[PDB]
C-alpha cells in the first residue's frame, strides 16, 4: 500500500505532463480507500509499467486503468458502477485508437463519480452500444456523449434537465449511425450541455462556421461546457473555438 505511493512519486520525478503526475496520485489516493489487495496490486503494477515508458500517451492510459479500478474497487460500489468499468475496459482494449482508449477510460471515471442511477444506466447502455458496433466514429461520439452526460449529473443538474439530456444521447447515437459529420455531432454535444443547464441558445451559420452563442451561464457551468467540448472535439477531430465574455459563451465550429 505504501509502496503504491512511492511508484507514483518516482513517476513525477521524471515526468512533467500534468495528467501523469495527477493520475499517479489519484490512483494512490483511491488505493488506501479500497484495501482489497487485488486493487493494491493492479495500481502498483500499472505504476511500475508507467515507470518503464517514455511514451506519455501510454503512461496516461496505464494510469487511467488504475484509477478506474480503484474507483469501483471500493466496497461501496453498486452493480451499474461495476458494469461501467467492465465495458470501459473491454471497449478500450479492443480498440487501437488512443482516443477511444482515453475516451472510454475518462468517460467511465467521470461516470463512476456519481451514484445517480439514471446516469449510470445511460452510460452502461451507451457502452453496450459502442461495444456492439464497429464504426469508430460512432464510438468516438458515444463516449463523448456519455462523458458530457456524466459531467452534468456530477455538476448537479436537475433530474428534469438530465432526462432532456438523455434524449440528446439517443439523438447523438442514432444520428452517427446514418453518417453525420464530425461537426454536426459535436453540435449535439453542445445542445446537451445547454439543454442540460437550462440556459439560452442562438444558432447562426456563416459559410461552414456554425457559431453558437450561449448566455446566462455561471463559471461553475462554463467549466463543464469547456471540459466536455474539449473532450468531444478531441475524439471527433473537430477544430472548435470557444469564446467567453463574462456571462456569455460563444462556440464556433
Amino acid at each position: 500500500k505504501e509502496e503504491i505511493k512511492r511508484l507514483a512519486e518516482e513517476l513525477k520525478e521524471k515526468t512533467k505532463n500534468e495528467e501523469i503526475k495527477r493520475l499517479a496520485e489519484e490512483a494512490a489516493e483511491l488505493a488506501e480507500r479500497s484495501d482489497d489487495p487485488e486493487v493494491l496490486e493492479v495500481v502498483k503494477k500499472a505504476l511500475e509499467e508507467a515507470l518503464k515508458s517514455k511514451n506519455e500517451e501510454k503512461i496516461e492510459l496505464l494510469l487511467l486503468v488504475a484509477v478506474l479500478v480503484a474507483e469501483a474497487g471500493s466496497v461501496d460500489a453498486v452493480e451499474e458502477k461495476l458494469e461501467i468499468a467492465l465495458l470501459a475496459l473491454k471497449l478500450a482494449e479492443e480498440s487501437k485508437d488512443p482516443r477511444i482508449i482515453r475516451g472510454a477510460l475518462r468517460a467511465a471515471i467521470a461516470a463512476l463519480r456519481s451514484d445517480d442511477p439514471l446516469a449510470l444506466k445511460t452510460v452502461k447502455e451507451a457502452l453496450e452500444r459502442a461495444r456492439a458496433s464497429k464504426d469508430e466514429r460512432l464510438i468516438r461520439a458515444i463516449l463523448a456523449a456519455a462523458y458530457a452526460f456524466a459531467l452534468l449529473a456530477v455538476a448537479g443538474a436537475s433530474a428534469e434537465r438530465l432526462k432532456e439530456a438523455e434524449a440528446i444521447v439517443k439523438e447523438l447515437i442514432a444520428a452517427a449511425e446514418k453518417g453525420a459529420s464530425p461537426q454536426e455531432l459535436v453540435l449535439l454535444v453542445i445542445e446537451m450541455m445547454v439543454k442540460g443547464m437550462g440556459v439560452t441558445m442562438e444558432t447562426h451559420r456563416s459559410g461552414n462556421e456554425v457559431k453558437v452563442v450561449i448566455k446566462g451561464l455561471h463559471e461553475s457551468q462554463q467549466e463543464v461546457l469547456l471540459e466536455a467540448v474539449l473532450f468531444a472535439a478531441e475524439l471527433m477531430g473537430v477544430r472548435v473555438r470557444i469564446r467567453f465574455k463574462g456571462d456569455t459563451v460563444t462556440i464556433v465550429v
Partner: peptide, 23 residues
Amino acid sequence: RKKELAKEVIETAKKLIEKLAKE
C-alpha cells in the same frame, strides 16, 4: 452476484497491461 464482475474487471486490465508488453 456483483463481485463476479469485479474479478473480470481486474483480469481485463491484467492482460491489457501485460500483453501490451509482449514486444
